[PDB]
Design an enzyme around this catalytic site. Structure first.
Site, PDB file in Angstrom:
ATOM      1  N   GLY A  42       0.815  -1.194   0.000  1.00  0.00           N
ATOM      2  CA  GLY A  42       0.000   0.000   0.000  1.00  0.00           C
ATOM      3  C   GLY A  42       0.848   1.242   0.000  1.00  0.00           C
ATOM      4  O   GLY A  42       2.081   1.195   0.026  1.00  0.00           O
ATOM      5  N   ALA A  43       0.150   2.366  -0.039  1.00  0.00           N
ATOM      6  CA  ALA A  43       0.767   3.674   0.027  1.00  0.00           C
ATOM      7  C   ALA A  43       0.238   4.332   1.281  1.00  0.00           C
ATOM      8  O   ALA A  43      -0.980   4.432   1.472  1.00  0.00           O
ATOM      9  CB  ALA A  43       0.394   4.517  -1.194  1.00  0.00           C
TER      10      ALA A  43
ATOM     11  N   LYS B  97       6.245   0.215   7.372  1.00  0.00           N
ATOM     12  CA  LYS B  97       5.909   1.518   6.825  1.00  0.00           C
ATOM     13  C   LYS B  97       7.206   2.295   6.682  1.00  0.00           C
ATOM     14  O   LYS B  97       7.960   2.418   7.648  1.00  0.00           O
ATOM     15  CB  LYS B  97       4.963   2.274   7.756  1.00  0.00           C
ATOM     16  CG  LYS B  97       3.661   1.552   7.996  1.00  0.00           C
ATOM     17  CD  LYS B  97       2.589   2.543   8.443  1.00  0.00           C
ATOM     18  CE  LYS B  97       2.644   2.867   9.913  1.00  0.00           C
ATOM     19  NZ  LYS B  97       1.272   3.283  10.351  1.00  0.00           N
TER      20      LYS B  97
ATOM     21  N   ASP C 247     -10.606   9.439  15.152  1.00  0.00           N
ATOM     22  CA  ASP C 247     -10.647   9.009  13.758  1.00  0.00           C
ATOM     23  C   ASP C 247     -11.030   7.535  13.656  1.00  0.00           C
ATOM     24  O   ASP C 247     -10.543   6.812  12.784  1.00  0.00           O
ATOM     25  CB  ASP C 247      -9.291   9.290  13.108  1.00  0.00           C
ATOM     26  CG  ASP C 247      -9.323   9.233  11.597  1.00  0.00           C
ATOM     27  OD1 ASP C 247     -10.371   9.542  10.998  1.00  0.00           O
ATOM     28  OD2 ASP C 247      -8.274   8.874  11.008  1.00  0.00           O
TER      29      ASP C 247
ATOM     30  N   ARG D 272     -12.080   1.783   8.086  1.00  0.00           N
ATOM     31  CA  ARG D 272     -10.852   1.877   7.300  1.00  0.00           C
ATOM     32  C   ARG D 272      -9.598   1.949   8.172  1.00  0.00           C
ATOM     33  O   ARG D 272      -8.487   1.719   7.672  1.00  0.00           O
ATOM     34  CB  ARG D 272     -10.901   3.100   6.385  1.00  0.00           C
ATOM     35  CG  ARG D 272     -10.783   4.412   7.148  1.00  0.00           C
ATOM     36  CD  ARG D 272     -10.924   5.624   6.241  1.00  0.00           C
ATOM     37  NE  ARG D 272     -10.264   6.760   6.865  1.00  0.00           N
ATOM     38  CZ  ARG D 272     -10.852   7.572   7.733  1.00  0.00           C
ATOM     39  NH1 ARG D 272     -12.124   7.383   8.060  1.00  0.00           N
ATOM     40  NH2 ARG D 272     -10.163   8.576   8.271  1.00  0.00           N
ATOM     41  N   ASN D 273      -9.743   2.260   9.462  1.00  0.00           N
ATOM     42  CA  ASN D 273      -8.632   2.343  10.395  1.00  0.00           C
ATOM     43  C   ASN D 273      -8.526   1.123  11.306  1.00  0.00           C
ATOM     44  O   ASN D 273      -7.753   1.140  12.271  1.00  0.00           O
ATOM     45  CB  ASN D 273      -8.716   3.645  11.214  1.00  0.00           C
ATOM     46  CG  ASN D 273      -8.336   4.859  10.396  1.00  0.00           C
ATOM     47  OD1 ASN D 273      -7.581   4.746   9.428  1.00  0.00           O
ATOM     48  ND2 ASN D 273      -8.851   6.028  10.776  1.00  0.00           N
TER      49      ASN D 273
ATOM     50  N   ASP E 288      -4.585   2.942  13.223  1.00  0.00           N
ATOM     51  CA  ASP E 288      -4.084   4.202  12.679  1.00  0.00           C
ATOM     52  C   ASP E 288      -4.067   5.258  13.777  1.00  0.00           C
ATOM     53  O   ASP E 288      -5.121   5.663  14.275  1.00  0.00           O
ATOM     54  CB  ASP E 288      -4.936   4.672  11.509  1.00  0.00           C
ATOM     55  CG  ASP E 288      -4.264   5.771  10.710  1.00  0.00           C
ATOM     56  OD1 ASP E 288      -3.716   5.473   9.625  1.00  0.00           O
ATOM     57  OD2 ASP E 288      -4.282   6.933  11.175  1.00  0.00           O
TER      58      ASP E 288
HETATM   59  C1  DXK Z   1      -1.608  -5.184   6.122  1.00  0.00           C
HETATM   60  N1  DXK Z   1      -1.053  -4.534   7.330  1.00  0.00           N
HETATM   61  N2  DXK Z   1      -0.659  -5.109   8.432  1.00  0.00           N
HETATM   62  C2  DXK Z   1      -0.259  -4.138   9.274  1.00  0.00           C
HETATM   63  C3  DXK Z   1      -0.378  -2.949   8.647  1.00  0.00           C
HETATM   64  C4  DXK Z   1      -0.121  -1.670   8.991  1.00  0.00           C
HETATM   65  N3  DXK Z   1       0.377  -1.409  10.206  1.00  0.00           N
HETATM   66  N4  DXK Z   1      -0.361  -0.657   8.140  1.00  0.00           N
HETATM   67  C5  DXK Z   1      -0.868  -0.929   6.929  1.00  0.00           C
HETATM   68  C6  DXK Z   1      -1.099   0.136   6.055  1.00  0.00           C
HETATM   69  C7  DXK Z   1      -0.982   1.441   6.526  1.00  0.00           C
HETATM   70  C8  DXK Z   1      -1.197   2.532   5.683  1.00  0.00           C
HETATM   71  C9  DXK Z   1      -1.520   2.317   4.352  1.00  0.00           C
HETATM   72  N5  DXK Z   1      -1.632   1.007   3.859  1.00  0.00           N
HETATM   73  C10 DXK Z   1      -1.406  -0.094   4.717  1.00  0.00           C
HETATM   74  N6  DXK Z   1      -1.128  -2.203   6.573  1.00  0.00           N
HETATM   75  C11 DXK Z   1      -0.888  -3.206   7.439  1.00  0.00           C
END
Ligand code: DXK
Length: 277
Positions: free
Chosen positions: A19-20, A44, A137, A141-142, A155
Site C-alpha cells: 500500500g501507500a 511503513k 478518527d 478503514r482504520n 491508525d
Molecule cells: C496489512 N497490514 N498489516 C499491518 C499494517 C499496517 N500497520 N499498516 C498498513 C497500512 C498502513 C497505511 C496504508 N496502507 C497499509 N497495513 C498493514
C-alpha cells in the site's frame, strides 16, 4: 522514542508492496528478532526527501503506538530511526482494512462472527478510553484484520484535521463537528458508525448524500437505517451510540459488556434464515 525498540535494518526483509501510506510506501515483510523463527510484519517507510515535519509526525506515530499494549490495538515491533529509510514495523494483519475486507466477503460471515469482530474493536476502544486516549478518527478503514479474524485499531497518525489526514464528517459526533468537543463519548458515536459499516459489509455511511446534508439530517434527528438481517439489539446499540446528548451514550465498557451478553445468548443474533433455510 523511549517507547520504541530500535531495530537494525539488517533484521528486516521487505518482500512486497502492500500500500501507500501518508509518509511513503508500506510493505509486507519479515523481521528477525532476538536466533529464532522470523515473524511476518508490516513495514511503513518514510519516503526519501521527507520534510522535517514529516519526519517528526512519522516517528511521533510510533511513539504513540508504543504506549499501548492490548490485544485489539496494533502491536508495534519497533522502529528504524538511525538508518535510512526510516521505518515503523508492526505486526502483520493479513486481511487488511476491515471495510475493504468485508466488502470482498459480502455475506460470507455469520452474525456471531461479525459481532465478535465488533466486540474486539470495542475492547480496544475500552482500553484506549481507560488510558485517556481519544482516538478522533475511529472508522472501519482504520481497523485491520489478521488471519484469525482479530480486529485491531491501527491508525494513530498525528497530522489529522477535521474535514471541510482528514477526519471525515460522516464518522464524527455532532458536538465534535460543531464545537470541537472530541472525547471518548464522541469516539462512541464513531463506534456506532463502525457497527453499521460491519453489519452492512462495508457500505458507505449516508451513501452519497453530501456532507452538508449529512450534518443537517443528523442534527434534525436522522439516523442510519437498520441493515438487512441486523439483530434488533445490535441496531438498538448503534442508536444508543448515536444519542444526540453525549452523556446518554454508553461507555465502551458498557458496549463490551452488552456485546458479551449477546454472544452468550446467540439466539439473540439469529435471523429468519437461521429458522427457515
Ligand atoms: C496489512 N497490514 N498489516 C499491518 C499494517 C499496517 N500497520 N499498516 C498498513 C497500512 C498502513 C497505511 C496504508 N496502507 C497499509 N497495513 C498493514
Amino acid at each position: 522514542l523511549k517507547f520504541t525498540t530500535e531495530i537494525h535494518p539488517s533484521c528486516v526483509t521487505r518482500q512486497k508492496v502492500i500500500g501507500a501510506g501518508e509518509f511513503g510506501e508500506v510493505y509486507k515483510g519479515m523481521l528477525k528478532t532476538s536466533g529464532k523463527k522470523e515473524v511476518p510484519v508490516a513495514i511503513k517507510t518514510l519516503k526519501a526527501g521527507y520534510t522535517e515535519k514529516q519526519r517528526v509526525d512519522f516517528l511521533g506515530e510510533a511513539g504513540i503506538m508504543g504506549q499501548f499494549s492490548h490485544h485489539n490495538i496494533i502491536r508495534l515491533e519497533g522502529v528504524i530511526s538511525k538508518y535510512k529509510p526510516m521505518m515503523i514495523i508492526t505486526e502483520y494483519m493479513e486481511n487488511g482494512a476491515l471495510d475493504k475486507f468485508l466488502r470482498e466477503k459480502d455475506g460470507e460471515f455469520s452474525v456471531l462472527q461479525l459481532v465478535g469482530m465488533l466486540r474486539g474493536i470495542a475492547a480496544g476502544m475500552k482500553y484506549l478510553a481507560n488510558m485517556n486516549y481519544v482516538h478522533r478518527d475511529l472508522a472501519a478503514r482504520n481497523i485491520l484484520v489478521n488471519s484469525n479474524l482479530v480486529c485491531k485499531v491501527s491508525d494513530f497518525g498525528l497530522s489529522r484535521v477535521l474535514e471541510d489526514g482528514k477526519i471525515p464528517i460522516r464518522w464524527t459526533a455532532p458536538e465534535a463537528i460543531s464545537y470541537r468537543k472530541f472525547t471518548s463519548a464522541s469516539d462512541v458515536w464513531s463506534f456506532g458508525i463502525v457497527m453499521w459499516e460491519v453489519m452492512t459489509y462495508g457500505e458507505r455511511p449516508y451513501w452519497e448524500l453530501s456532507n452538508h446534508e449529512v450534518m443537517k439530517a443528523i442534527n434534525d434527528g436522522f439516523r442510519l437505517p437498520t441493515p438487512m438481517d441486523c439483530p434488533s439489539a445490535i441496531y438498538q446499540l448503534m442508536m444508543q451510540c448515536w444519542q444526540q446528548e453525549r452523556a446518554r451514550r454508553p461507555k465502551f465498557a458498557d458496549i463490551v459488556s452488552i456485546l458479551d451478553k449477546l454472544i452468550r445468548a446467540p439466539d439473540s443474533l439469529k435471523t429468519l434464515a437461521d429458522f427457515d433455510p
